[PDB]
């Protein structure tokens, strides 16, 4: 019945939710792997315990634990796992499972919103075109004219393994990355291998900077196909500073909608290999990681110059100073456009408040300190000072291999 | 034989040193405690294995593993643990053990220096006055006119338990903290309970801000006694900015020498309860933690004002902007005074290089990501992007209770 302390407010909370934890973390009694980025077909025997566990907590949630309805649904799913060696989720069960996959995502600082999630049931989808249509309506709904709304679209679950629905993009909206004749890189270096796959499958690249990538959609295990998101559905924010008018000359912009598409949603032992989900951006993901990561857009070089900073000396903190301006500007631009965004102080304060609620009415909140603390100004945000216990609850979002490493291809 | 990756350079290194790990981390297979700050008399039976292990690696180090000298020293220490149920370290063994306690300190970003350590053997000390004298010569030597040098002074080891040598200060040099009649706090709020103990034992407090605290020294389990470090031995740096002359008006200064005095040094199963050790400061400990921690000096309030920043809105990043100036100033002040200091970019780069050396010639480097990453500008330093394995090797520095919670007092 462990305790976690906050070393800024002296607040203690008691965690018992970790007792319901099931999966393994990577750590042992003699080694901690909490800074490792990714540490490590199904059968019908394994499937009923997972189904039972999920069903027991779902009916526990609607305040009908063990009622006739719960007992009949247990027997019903049991027999469906006899008949088909799989089963199907109720609409209500799918919405509960998705909302709790988010709720349980220990690397997510935005979970105070977890119960406000819009679930789009695309389990009737059969083709890549159908996926494109579903994905388009997700983008339009979640963007909502810049008044962004959280959403997830859930495609058919894995069955045999070789019939998988997969979005090959890592995010629904990403900027292209092309290498150069002189060896360097234009666009987004993260995506250079994906940008090349698109071209290998027929993409005709407008080889510039902020070129939105096309979708690569694989349906029912078939080879994936290219589709272009109507550019009117792709909302973008131009980045200006509220002081420095040379900022516009920098010519930077980002897309409004963060939408992860490469993860796996697990519910009651069922695996949804395509489940794109979207929220809104925290400022630092664009301004610190996207723009100033050394292997991403890498703009500290220029923003420092155009401020005339002492770049000769490492200890002038020219890099730090240019970093704060960039994030004031990303924020400023998004807000003056009514496009939803959150600064890393408001987001981290909300997560402390979210943590308090979870410990009260749930007995804990799995949390990954390495990922919750923002990538700048860490100790002036309250989560730096907050002990967190990390553990794996289900339903959950999991990593999965890139599909071009697994897909027994064909044509 | 685990692997750790750097996600900025794609470099991989292989860790086998973790196999020599002995102590437990707090984590299990189902919970990770890597963000918990402090997770959890000796006998003669437990003592020989610890002595043997330490001796086997010491003689392995001087390239005489298993020689006659090693076999005789094993038998000699064995028999001394028969005779006294304890044993005594050789001068060479004490220096090796201390240097490796540092080398093994997974929370320390400065370990590239671990083999340059000056060891002061105070095991002949018998009185609090003798401790004062030893501590004074440590301060003078390590300060070295601002050309700081690393050092440790090792007082008699624990024997029965009730005869402990302890420095009651948490650091040799700290600023006093006094509460106020109006409820607030002057000085350093961290130390308000220690500042009060000093007064309860007879300290006459010059109730101001940067008042250097007196030593509280307990010798051979006796009640501790107060001593004032000659102020000429306490080097201090006045904090000015290289742009903002209102900075001097702020009237800030810090002491040059970071010297931890409350930790326990463990060598071959022997426990040195008083082992003050000192290096030089990394800029962010003063400028970010000491000055801008909410429960420390808490100056973001004023530095923001005197810059005229948008403090009405949380998302103006006024706090971030005022943070970068303060750390440019702490650094600038220390350097213009020839007083050794390191910026968080140079320090974190050196630790990557140190990590590479350890994996090569040692098979690993225990490392605590939560503590290695600096408390500001985290992801623009290379350690943010560096996976680290944490594990506990011995010799080691350990936490221990504050002595005023344990000391069976008297007079
Ligand atoms: C509501 C607005 C949201 C905000 C402000 C937010 C914030 C964040 C941030 C800053 C990250 C770190 C991303 C990174 O550094 O790679 C993250 C990760 C994550 N978010 Fe949230 N998020 C939001 C909505 C959502 C939604 C709707 C879901 C799922 C339904 C979700 C699930 C996750 C997951 C699973 C991760 C982990 C990604 C990984 O491990 O690579 N978030 N979130
Ligand atoms: C050579 C210059 C050094 C630098 C730049 C340096 C840097 C640091 C920093 C920034 C911390 C974090 C302190 C905190 O946030 O509380 C730390 C912790 C630590 N340092 Fe180093 N250090 C140096 C020398 C030393 C020496 C000489 C020793 C021991 C002989 C040492 C042992 C430790 C230990 C044991 C900790 C952990 C303290 C704790 O867990 O609370 N360091 N160091
Ligand atoms: C591989 N890391 C995952 C990842 C990469 C990105 F690019 C993101 F934008 C987000 C993300 C996702 C959501 C729903 C909200 C938010 N604020 N960020 C997550
Ligand atoms: C309880 N945390 C430990 C702690 C507190 C402090 F105030 C320090 F200054 C240091 C420290 C120690 C050394 C040898 C070098 C350095 N750069 N910092 C460590
Ligand atoms: C090595 C380390 O685990 C890696 O850099 C992690 C650190 N924490 C992070 N935290 C967030 N939010 N996003 C990230 O990509 C990372 N990267
Ligand atoms: C909760 C958390 O473990 C605590 O704030 C830690 C985080 N990392 C730290 N890292 C350093 N270097 N120093 C600290 O005091 C802390 N505090
Ligand atoms: Zn761990």
Short mmCIF file of N, CA, C and O and ligand atoms in Angstrom, two decimals, chain A residues 25-28 31-35 390, chain B residues 25-28 31-35 390, ligand 7:
data_model
loop_
_atom_site.label_atom_id
_atom_site.label_comp_id
_atom_site.label_asym_id
_atom_site.label_seq_id
_atom_site.Cartn_x
_atom_site.Cartn_y
_atom_site.Cartn_z
N UNK A 25 7.05 -4.34 -16.02
CA UNK A 25 7.57 -3.00 -16.28
C UNK A 25 8.94 -2.99 -16.97
O UNK A 25 9.28 -1.99 -17.61
N UNK A 26 9.71 -4.06 -16.87
CA UNK A 26 11.09 -4.06 -17.28
C UNK A 26 12.06 -4.00 -16.12
O UNK A 26 13.22 -4.44 -16.26
N UNK A 27 11.62 -3.49 -14.98
CA UNK A 27 12.50 -3.40 -13.83
C UNK A 27 12.48 -4.71 -13.05
O UNK A 27 11.51 -5.48 -13.09
N UNK A 28 13.57 -4.98 -12.35
CA UNK A 28 13.64 -6.08 -11.40
C UNK A 28 13.93 -5.49 -10.01
O UNK A 28 13.94 -4.28 -9.82
N UNK A 31 17.53 -3.80 -10.87
CA UNK A 31 17.78 -2.89 -11.98
C UNK A 31 16.49 -2.16 -12.31
O UNK A 31 15.40 -2.74 -12.29
N UNK A 32 16.61 -0.87 -12.58
CA UNK A 32 15.47 -0.03 -12.91
C UNK A 32 15.66 0.44 -14.34
O UNK A 32 16.74 0.90 -14.70
N UNK A 33 14.61 0.26 -15.15
CA UNK A 33 14.66 0.60 -16.56
C UNK A 33 13.75 1.76 -16.90
O UNK A 33 13.37 1.94 -18.06
N UNK A 34 13.40 2.57 -15.90
CA UNK A 34 12.51 3.68 -16.15
C UNK A 34 13.01 4.74 -17.11
O UNK A 34 12.26 5.67 -17.37
N UNK A 35 14.25 4.67 -17.61
CA UNK A 35 14.64 5.59 -18.68
C UNK A 35 14.79 4.89 -20.03
O UNK A 35 15.22 5.53 -20.99
N UNK A 390 5.01 4.09 -11.43
CA UNK A 390 4.66 3.61 -12.77
C UNK A 390 4.31 2.13 -12.71
O UNK A 390 5.04 1.34 -12.10
N UNK B 25 16.76 -2.02 -5.64
CA UNK B 25 16.46 -0.70 -6.18
C UNK B 25 15.16 -0.10 -5.68
O UNK B 25 15.00 1.13 -5.71
N UNK B 26 14.22 -0.91 -5.21
CA UNK B 26 12.88 -0.47 -4.94
C UNK B 26 11.87 -0.91 -5.98
O UNK B 26 10.67 -1.01 -5.67
N UNK B 27 12.33 -1.19 -7.19
CA UNK B 27 11.43 -1.62 -8.24
C UNK B 27 11.20 -3.12 -8.17
O UNK B 27 12.04 -3.88 -7.67
N UNK B 28 10.05 -3.55 -8.65
CA UNK B 28 9.77 -4.97 -8.84
C UNK B 28 9.51 -5.21 -10.33
O UNK B 28 9.68 -4.32 -11.16
N UNK B 31 6.26 -2.79 -10.72
CA UNK B 31 6.21 -1.40 -10.31
C UNK B 31 7.61 -0.82 -10.38
O UNK B 31 8.60 -1.47 -10.02
N UNK B 32 7.71 0.41 -10.87
CA UNK B 32 8.98 1.10 -11.01
C UNK B 32 8.93 2.30 -10.08
O UNK B 32 7.95 3.05 -10.08
N UNK B 33 9.97 2.45 -9.26
CA UNK B 33 10.05 3.51 -8.27
C UNK B 33 11.14 4.50 -8.59
O UNK B 33 11.60 5.24 -7.70
N UNK B 34 11.56 4.56 -9.85
CA UNK B 34 12.63 5.47 -10.21
C UNK B 34 12.34 6.94 -10.03
O UNK B 34 13.24 7.74 -10.28
N UNK B 35 11.13 7.36 -9.63
CA UNK B 35 10.94 8.76 -9.26
C UNK B 35 10.75 8.95 -7.76
O UNK B 35 10.47 10.08 -7.33
N UNK B 390 19.87 2.04 -14.01
CA UNK B 390 20.20 2.32 -12.62
C UNK B 390 20.31 1.03 -11.84
O UNK B 390 19.45 0.15 -11.95
ZN1 LIG C 7 12.27 1.17 -12.15
#
